[PDB]
Subunit: 173 residues, 4 copies
């Protein structure tokens, strides 16, 4: 019914955010209230100094609470998720994703770090008590032909995105 | 509705198996067809030398394929799942858990090894292409009052098993 | 000969930093040039927006290059290292720890997350090509009796610290 | 100087074993006493049913204890080390690798599973109390030109093995 999408790259434009964009598009047809957030909606001072009286944190935290699902995207940095993304996750309440379906998306420079999603990001999402976590979609940088403007992907990436998004849509019932 | 239960303990009875026995009991209550497998169903030489023509592997494989969901249980050895269970997972086809809901259970000598589920078992189950992986249940040995004659758990662990099984049943629609 | 120490908690005072403090003390006797850094030496805007033209980054990056070793401390947040710490690590060059001995220290609220060091922090340090990574020291919050003033630890924690620091000192030759 | 080499592959000859054979050869060149073990030294039933009275386990254990360092090699199965190797690691005493330098080697069908070394194998070796764990070497199968009759590697992989072995030898002082 409601879905939070969360872009986790500190950079803009972002290759991994182009994956969230295609997802957002897909849902915006199916009349689902999609609330999109990126790191630029928070004050860097709040995230870095772990400040829970953050006003932006509160609004986000509120909107998450009412969400049925989360789609979250990260670049791979040093074989794991972005630090930047993590600093926000660290401010969520202990059971923040209790009862929600979670779909993780990632882009990375090398195929050699495909496993960063399963080994690094999923356990954090799980510590936040995600009720179920989908297989997810990792894409190396060669899969994204264009993102500065409209996202363009190889049919392989697009198809895998499609499949995941279909599974997520079903799981939200 | 078909579910496979898979005991990953090298000994029998085990603490981790008592969790599956309790699971079996609750799912039979709902007219799910439950099929139990343990490591004692395979010849040690077939698993330890990765022999793909193992007759039991072919039977397990046909059974898994027809199954809608999998509950797998392991003890926690050296900060991970058991090698023993892993010998069998290594012999399954590449997409063996595609289209399937997976619930992982585990028991551990110390709470210090709780992260073994998220950081070690889950990524293996995801390499097999599990469609979705539930939060799961970890119990340190002190929560399993009896695993020999009748599964008996502390109230907290029994409540967490029930919450997990209810989520797992709902997922199978 | 030279050692970087790096406090990774966004908070001050810090329980995990008290572990670095005892380490710093230990080395300051043995005439080793110890360069200490915490996250407060960087601008939160630089870390969050991934800015490599950071002046503080340069100085740190320079001092690391000449260091024989790194001792790094993190609180456990959401079953992994701090996001805050990670945002700095993400700005280091790809082979930043090539040729260095690395000792990781951590404090966490629950024993249940002892494995966050080995499963989450070590692989990042390794992606940065640490030449060798020591076993490390994890301490749950009950081990630290006092840190607002002088650090006070249980003899168990202190002894394990001692042992690790001895091993690190030897490895720096 | 005593080193144990331990082949974790369930088949022989294996790609991962060719790395150890090359290692053996280089260390004998330096009058290190090298002791090679593989899974074929143990009875499959002892490993798969965790039987502690395995005579070979007692011999391996005495040998490990007297050893200064360990080089262990595994193929990468389902995003991790082999279950087969893990069955043997599960049977070693709690502090088996205390006081020891460990070098991990691995080979994989795809570069996509490179993180199996850091995210899966290393935490197991650290649960055994390895004093220090070197960066190690991962090679995808395409880097091993021959493992049957004479180990032959691409120049890049041979250079990385040499760098690792030189670090390992230096560590043994
Ligand atoms: C600071 C930084 C660190 C990176 N480290 C890795 C890495 O460890 N492994 C990898 O495969 N790619 C690495 N890359 C490449 C990115 O993960 C890749 O280009 C990704 O698509 C960027 O996504 P984004 O546009 O959303 O930032 C790194 C990139 C940056 C900027
Ligand atoms: C060979 C062996 C190794 C073990 N290593 C660990 C360990 O590393 N960490 C831990 O928490 N418990 C360890 N234990 C204890 C088991 O995790 C715990 O007692 C478990 O519940 C036994 O489960 P089972 O009866 O299903 O086999 C080990 C037990 C055995 C037999
Ligand atoms: C934002 C936040 C998240 C935390 N999450 C966890 C956690 O997942 N697991 C845990 O054991 N402790 C958790 N804790 C407790 C801390 O890890 C623990 O109190 C630690 O000693 C703090 O160290 P520091 O003073 O250096 O910040 C968390 C604490 C904070 C402030
Ligand atoms: C049962 C089995 C499972 C495998 N699964 C994977 C895998 O999940 N990921 C991967 O990268 N390679 C996988 N492979 C390929 C091996 O990782 C690769 O070919 C390896 O180098 C074989 O090493 P070995 O000859 O030392 O046994 C698998 C091979 C076998 C026999």
């Amino acid at each position: 019914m409601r879905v939070i999408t969360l872009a986790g790259s500190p950079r803009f434009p972002s290759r991994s955010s182009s994956l969230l964009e295609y997802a957002r598009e897909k849902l915006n047809g199916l009349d689902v209230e999609v609330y999109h957030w990126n790191l630029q909606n928070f004050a860097p001072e709040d995230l870095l100094y772990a400040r829970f009286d953050s006003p932006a944190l509160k609004t986000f935290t509120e909107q998450l609470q009412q969400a049925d699902g989360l789609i979250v995207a990260t670049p791979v940095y040093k074989a794991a998720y972005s630090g930047a993304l993590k600093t926000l996750l660290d401010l969520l309440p202990e059971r923040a994703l209790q009862g929600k379906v979670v779909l993780p998306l990632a882009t990375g420079g090398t195929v050699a770090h495909l496993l960063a999603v399963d080994y690094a990001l999923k356990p954090v999402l799980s510590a936040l008590k995600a009720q179920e976590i989908l297989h997810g979609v990792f894409a190396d940088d060669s899969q994204v032909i264009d993102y500065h403007h409209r996202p363009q992907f190889t049919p392989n990436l697009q198809t895998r995105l499609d499949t995941a998004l279909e599974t997520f849509w079903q799981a939200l019932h």
